[PDB]
Amino acid sequence: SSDTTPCCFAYIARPLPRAHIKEYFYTSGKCSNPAVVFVTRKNRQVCANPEKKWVREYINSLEMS
Amino acid sequence: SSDTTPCCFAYIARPLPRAHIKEYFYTSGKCSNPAVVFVTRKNRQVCANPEKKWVREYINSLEMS
Amino acid sequence: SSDTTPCCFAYIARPLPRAHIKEYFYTSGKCSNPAVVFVTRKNRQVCANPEKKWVREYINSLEMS
Amino acid sequence: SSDTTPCCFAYIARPLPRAHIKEYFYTSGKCSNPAVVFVTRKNRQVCANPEKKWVREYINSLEMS
Amino acid sequence: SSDTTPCCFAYIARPLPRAHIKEYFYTSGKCSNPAVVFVTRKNRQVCANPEKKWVREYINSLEMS
Amino acid sequence: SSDTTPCCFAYIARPLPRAHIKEYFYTSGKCSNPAVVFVTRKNRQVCANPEKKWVREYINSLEMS
Amino acid sequence: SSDTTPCCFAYIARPLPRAHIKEYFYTSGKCSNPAVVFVTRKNRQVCANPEKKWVREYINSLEMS
Amino acid sequence: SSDTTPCCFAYIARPLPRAHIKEYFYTSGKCSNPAVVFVTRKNRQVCANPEKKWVREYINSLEMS
Amino acid sequence: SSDTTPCCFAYIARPLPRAHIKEYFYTSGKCSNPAVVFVTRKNRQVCANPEKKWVREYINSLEMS
Ligand SMILES: OC[C@H]1O[C@@H](O)[C@H](O)[C@@H](O)[C@@H]1O
Ligand SMILES: OC[C@H]1O[C@@H](O)[C@H](O)[C@@H](O)[C@@H]1O
Ligand SMILES: OC[C@H]1O[C@@H](O)[C@H](O)[C@@H](O)[C@@H]1O
Ligand SMILES: OC[C@H]1O[C@@H](O)[C@H](O)[C@@H](O)[C@@H]1O
Ligand SMILES: OC[C@H]1O[C@@H](O)[C@H](O)[C@@H](O)[C@@H]1O
Ligand SMILES: *[C@H]1O[C@H](CO)[C@H](O)[C@H](O)[C@H]1O
Ligand SMILES: *[C@H]1O[C@H](CO)[C@H](O)[C@H](O)[C@H]1O
Ligand SMILES: *[C@H]1O[C@H](CO)[C@H](O)[C@H](O)[C@H]1O
Ligand SMILES: *[C@H]1O[C@H](CO)[C@H](O)[C@H](O)[C@H]1O
Ligand SMILES: *[C@H]1O[C@H](CO)[C@H](O)[C@H](O)[C@H]1O
Ligand SMILES: *[C@H]1O[C@H](CO)[C@H](O)[C@H](O)[C@H]1O
Ligand SMILES: [Cl-]
Ligand SMILES: [Cl-]
Ligand SMILES: [Cl-]
Ligand SMILES: [Cl-]
Ligand SMILES: [Cl-]
Ligand SMILES: [Cl-]
Ligand SMILES: [Cl-]
Ligand SMILES: [Cl-]
Ligand SMILES: [Cl-]
Ligand SMILES: [Cl-]
Ligand SMILES: [Cl-]
Ligand SMILES: [Cl-]
Ligand SMILES: [Cl-]
Ligand SMILES: [Cl-]
Ligand SMILES: [Cl-]
Ligand SMILES: [Cl-]
Ligand SMILES: [Cl-]
Ligand SMILES: [Cl-]
Ligand SMILES: [Cl-]
Ligand SMILES: [Cl-]
DSSP: OBOOEEEOSSOOSSOOOGGGEEEEEEOOTTSSSOOEEEEETTOOEEEEOTTSHHHHHHHHHHHOO | OOBOEEEOSOOOSSOOOGGGEEEEEEOOTTSSSOOEEEEETTOOEEEEOTTSHHHHHHHHHHHOO | OBOOEEEOSOOOSSOOOGGGEEEEEEOOTTSSSOOEEEEETTOOEEEEOTTSHHHHHHHHHHHOO | OBOOEEEOSSOOSSOOOGGGEEEEEEOOTTSSSOOEEEEETTOOEEEEOTTSHHHHHHHHHHHTO | OBOOEEEOSOOOSSOOOGGGEEEEEEOOTTSSSOOEEEEETTOOEEEEOTTSHHHHHHHHHHHOO | OOBOEEEOSOOOSSOOOGGGEEEEEEOOTTSSSOOEEEEETTOOEEEEOTTSHHHHHHHHHHHOO | OOBOEEEOSOOOSSOOOGGGEEEEEEOOTTSSSOOEEEEETTOOEEEEOTTSHHHHHHHHHHHOO | OOOOOOOOSSOOSSOOOGGGEEEEEEOOTTSSSOOEEEEETTOOEEEEOTTSHHHHHHHHHHHTO | OBSOEEEOSOOOSSOOOGGGEEEEEEOOTTSSSOOEEEEETTOOEEEEOTTSHHHHHHHHHHHOO
């Protein structure tokens, strides 16, 4: 186990393919920049802006299943 | 006693969507900071500030179902 | 994923059986108390005193295996 | 790969066993808090304060082979 | 470990042979240009245009397997 | 050209010790931020601000021997 | 080794025009005085003090071309 | 070859004909007075003040071909 | 014209073939090491030990021709 925290300082511009996304998570509140991280099936991890529509829709899609 | 207990040391500013939350709990009073943790349908866990209005509203909504 | 942190507030009195320990970790520096956590074969987390000899020996055993 | 960055927001107080440490690294400059992360043989990861003598000594020990 | 980031400034013209791709990832959101990087079996990183059909199909192939 | 190139988007404030640096290089002029990367004996890589006095002193020392 | 190497034993105070410089190099570390030599388009060669701010500004500019 | 250095201790006031100049050079930093030497086709050599505009313009003209 | 000075830090071991030598000169008194430089027909500069008999004979040959 690790004491480090994953933070984001920038976001991807174009929406990654929804079908590739395995899960998501909100970055810690200690992070200076609020962000969402999408995790793909092969464990690519992409920082996303929670203020974006497609990001919110993706999260909504993941939770409601 | 000797079991770990979850503590929060910060809160994200942006409120997570009410419809995603399935339950909540208070962190132990032994923690340095008072906190509420919202658990989502997919078991994402977010620390929240109990002194915030929207947090209170969420808890009320969760309790009054 | 969760942004809560496993913190300890008490140390186990009786040394755990070594053959039950599958792994260990140090609690975050965010926690007010320094602590070692052992994870058992049954995935239970047990806080232990970092200064105790058996604790240091278990850790050294786990790392040097 | 991932575009999240490991950040530290607190430091361990007690020096961890030098012999357990496999490597170290400096956290990114994006991180609000400057830190050093020690990585053990079994990949425990511990945040450390680079302004501490034992931390600097450990780093010196690691890089000088 | 390094705090530099792999960024792209040009996209390969000829589609890479699929059988040589062993991994992909998206460049950080910090990079000025959006890009897809394919990692070859010879461990070389190749920038590709995210909009190109063969690029999206390669990614989709890599994630769904 | 289709190869990725290292870019820096921040610098740690605390100068790493001169003695563990074995080499340096400038990031591509295509990067949004001008930067120097110091490579340690154990191949840690740290982004540095070329406009800083200590960075230039280090480079001079590395190149004058 | 038996070949001569250029050394500098002083520096002109007034910085030469940046636009005139096409390249630069460090004198050998064997030279008693550390120095940078700027080479103009018409191949004039001027000794410069590497500890000067404008000199490192020039070098940085020449590198992030 | 010679280890004497050409130095200037005064400057011409009247600008010499640009078309007569085939080259220029900065006097060494060893010289007490910073200066520019213009060399004519028939190898007349004139000391000039680099702080004067016409001198700078002449140099700029020579370097930029 | 250049502000740098040709200095030597090593003496050639095998005496140059006399017929290859075009001219000679003494390195500046500014150089930390005394030396003789022979200029070859191919316009290369070779540092030589000023104490060696063959060096002094070559110089004597060149001056008394
Ligand atoms: O990864 C989430 C949590 O991990 C802990 O190790 C860190 O100390 C916390 O600050 C963080 O919120
Ligand atoms: O790739 C690793 C990370 O290094 C950090 O320094 C950067 O802020 C990130 O943008 C980058 O993704
Ligand atoms: O002008 C080209 C210059 O390149 C440098 O690397 C050499 O040390 C100089 O001797 C040479 O004059
Ligand atoms: O590593 C950067 C290199 O850039 C070249 O242009 C310089 O002449 C070298 O002195 C330098 O080492
Ligand atoms: O230092 C001795 C002198 O020798 C001459 O050849 C150089 O042009 C001067 O710059 C130098 O100062
Ligand atoms: C790492 O340690 C345990 C798992 O061993 C737990 O998930 C903690 O939350 C994490 O920091
Ligand atoms: C969420 O949990 C930890 C951090 O909380 C880590 O990044 C995991 O990869 C992710 O699933
Ligand atoms: C992860 O992706 C590649 C490796 O595949 C690279 O090392 C980057 O540094 C990281 O983002
Ligand atoms: C250093 O590289 C990345 C971050 O730069 C990651 O945390 C690795 O685990 C570490 O060794
Ligand atoms: C004179 O000697 C050689 C030419 O033979 C060289 O140019 C030196 O720089 C100069 O002092
Ligand atoms: C510049 O080179 C030497 C001195 O550096 C000499 O004066 C020449 O005449 C000039 O062209
Ligand atoms: Cl965005
Ligand atoms: Cl899914
Ligand atoms: Cl609900
Ligand atoms: Cl409020
Ligand atoms: Cl606590
Ligand atoms: Cl004991
Ligand atoms: Cl500390
Ligand atoms: Cl080691
Ligand atoms: Cl941060
Ligand atoms: Cl150190
Ligand atoms: Cl960039
Ligand atoms: Cl393209
Ligand atoms: Cl296409
Ligand atoms: Cl070194
Ligand atoms: Cl230029
Ligand atoms: Cl620059
Ligand atoms: Cl004048
Ligand atoms: Cl001309
Ligand atoms: Cl010298
Ligand atoms: Cl001899």
